[PDB]
């Protein structure tokens, strides 16, 4: 049983919400009308979102304790929905193309990459995820805006958002 | 029990995938690497999305049969993830404000509205959903781009545009 606990104030204090296994599209529909400043992931990997219905900024939440919201990459204490990643594939592999609809020079990866320029990659047009999930970041060295990629096809920049500078495998 | 079946070619032909209760963030992970042109919803309300992980254009799917993809509002037969709406509230109520962060003139609704101009509403800045879910449309008479609204707060236009392509919202409709 995969559990996550969200707290109102930093350092695990204040009112809380315990979520075991399930996916929550609306915190308000589950009684939680407050902000979220600290998270405790006991098991499993989750992705929390800024707005309800899984919209807005994405924040990856792997096993561990996050004392402040800055720890999970959140500018402010807003999180209105959370879901669990329950399907992970064996050998991670992602192919990123320099142009739209999977055209141009391709760059395959199967492990972390702190800087995409090092692959000779000029721009990120489309992305193909053969096995993952993978987590991408707006800036180098895995920092900034997060974008979660699951097994599938991402034809344009708007399928995940424009820049993408770093990536990392199965979370 | 909640079931939906997605088909490859129009009119319910070709390879298929049946989904019972569960939520699918990735069709590819579930073995389905093809397009989707026709859908058959036997029970429950679902929301299908263009890209994996619930991104891109949203498509509401209520009980019924959709022979072609144009029937569910899909420009192209691309659907890579689907989820079920399993929590609906009693008396639907939505309040839409004319500016951001819930400021300005408010306009409350509890039933369908084919045209928001009729409420004296000029622009849609923020949305508060007290009970739903509600489905919004980019054009009048419930047509165009779809946006699903669940119980919560929507401060800016970008809170309802996963594809930040259009800031207008012209019609709304209750519990699907």
From Swiss-Prot, chain B:
PROSITE patterns tied to this protein: CRYSTALLIN_BETA_GAMMA
InterPro entries: Beta/Gamma-Crystallin, Beta/gamma_crystallin, G_crystallin-like
Any one Gene Ontology BP term: visual perception
Listed GO MF terms: identical protein binding; structural constituent of eye lens
Domain Beta/gamma crystallin 'Greek key': from-to ranges: 2-43, 44-86, 92-131, 132-176
Pfam annotation, one family: Crystall
Protein purpose: Crystallins are the dominant structural components of the vertebrate eye lens.
Domain notes: Has a two-domain beta-structure, folded into four very similar Greek key motifs.
Family: Belongs to the beta/gamma-crystallin family.
UniProt subunit comment: Homo/heterodimer, or complexes of higher-order. The structure of beta-crystallin oligomers seems to be stabilized through interactions between the N-terminal arms.
Name under which the protein is recorded: Beta-crystallin B2
């Amino acid at each position: 049983e995969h559990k996550i606990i969200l707290y109102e104030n930093p350092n695990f204090t204040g009112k809380k919400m315990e979520i075991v296994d399930d996916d929550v599209p609306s915190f308000h529909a589950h009684g939680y009308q407050e902000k979220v400043s600290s998270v405790r992931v006991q098991s499993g990997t989750w992705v929390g979102y800024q707005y309800p219905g899984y919209r807005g900024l994405q924040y990856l939440l792997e096993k561990g304790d996050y004392k402040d919201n800055s720890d999970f990459g959140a500018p402010h204490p807003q999180v209105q929905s959370v879901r669990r990643i329950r399907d992970m594939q064996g050998n991670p592999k992602i192919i990123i193309f320099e142009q739209e609809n999977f055209q141009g020079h391709s760059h395959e990866l199967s492990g972390p990459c702190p800087n995409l320029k090092e692959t000779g990659m000029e721009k990120a047009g489309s992305v193909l995820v053969q096995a993952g999930p993978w987590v991408g970041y707006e800036q180098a060295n895995c920092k900034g805006e997060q974008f979660v990629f699951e097994k599938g096809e991402y034809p344009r920049w708007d399928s995940w958002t424009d820049s993408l500078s770093s990536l990392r495998p199965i979370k």
